[PDB]
Amino acid sequence: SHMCDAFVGTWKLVSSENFDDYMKEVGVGFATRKVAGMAKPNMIISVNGDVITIKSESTFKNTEISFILGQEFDEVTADDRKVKSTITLDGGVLVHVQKWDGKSTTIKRKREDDKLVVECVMKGVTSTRVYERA
Numbered sequence: 670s671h672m673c674d675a676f677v678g679t680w681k682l683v684s685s686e687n688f689d690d691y692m693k694e695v696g697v698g699f700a701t702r703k704v705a706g707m708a709k710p711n712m713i714i715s716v717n718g719d720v721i722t723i724k725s726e727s728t729f730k731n732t733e734i735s736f737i738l739g740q741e742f743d744e745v746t747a748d749d750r751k752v753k754s755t756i757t758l759d760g761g762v763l764v765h766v767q768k769w770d771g772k773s774t775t776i777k778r779k780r781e782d783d784k785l786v787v788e789c790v791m792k793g794v795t796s797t798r799v800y801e802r803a
C-alpha cells in the first residue's frame with residue numbers, strides 16, 4: 670500500500686462552485702468557459718511505481734498527465750495554456766502548481782469522506798469541484 674492509494678480510481682463530477690470565475694481569473698475566453706463549464710468530467714487516477722497518471726475526460730476535452738511527485742513537467746492544459754507543472758503531496762493533499770507567463774494557479778485534490786474534493790485557486794478566486802466514485 671502506498672502514496673496515493675485513496676486517490677486511485679474513477680471519479681465523476683457531482684458539483685461545482687465558482688468555476689466560471691476561476692476560469693475568468695485564469696484568462697480563459699468566453700466560448701471555452703461556456704463549453705468547459707458545461708462539462709461533467711470523469712477523473713481517472715492510477716499509479717504504477719513512482720509514476721502517477723491523471724486523466725480528465727468529458728465531452729469538452731480528454732486530457733492526460735503522467736508525473737513523478739516533485740518533478741516538474743511541461744503540460745498543455747485543456748484551454749491550451751503551455752504551463753510548467755509540479756505536483757507534490759503535502760500532508761495527504763495532492764498539490765498541482767502551474768506556472769506560465771509570470772502567473773501561477775494551484776489545484777489541490779483531497780479525499781474527504783467518500784468524495785474527492787478539487788480546489789482550484791487563482792489569486793483570490795477559489796472554485797470547489799466535488800467528485801464521487803463512478
Ligand SMILES: Oc1c(Cl)cc(C(O)(C(F)(F)F)C(F)(F)F)cc1Cl
Pocket residue numbers: 692695697701705706708710725726727729730732746747748749
Ligand atoms: O477537464 C478539464 C480540465 Cl483537465 C481543465 C479545464 C481548464 O483547463 C481549467 F479549468 F483547468 F483551467 C479550462 F480552462 F478549460 F477550464 C477544464 C476542464 Cl473541464
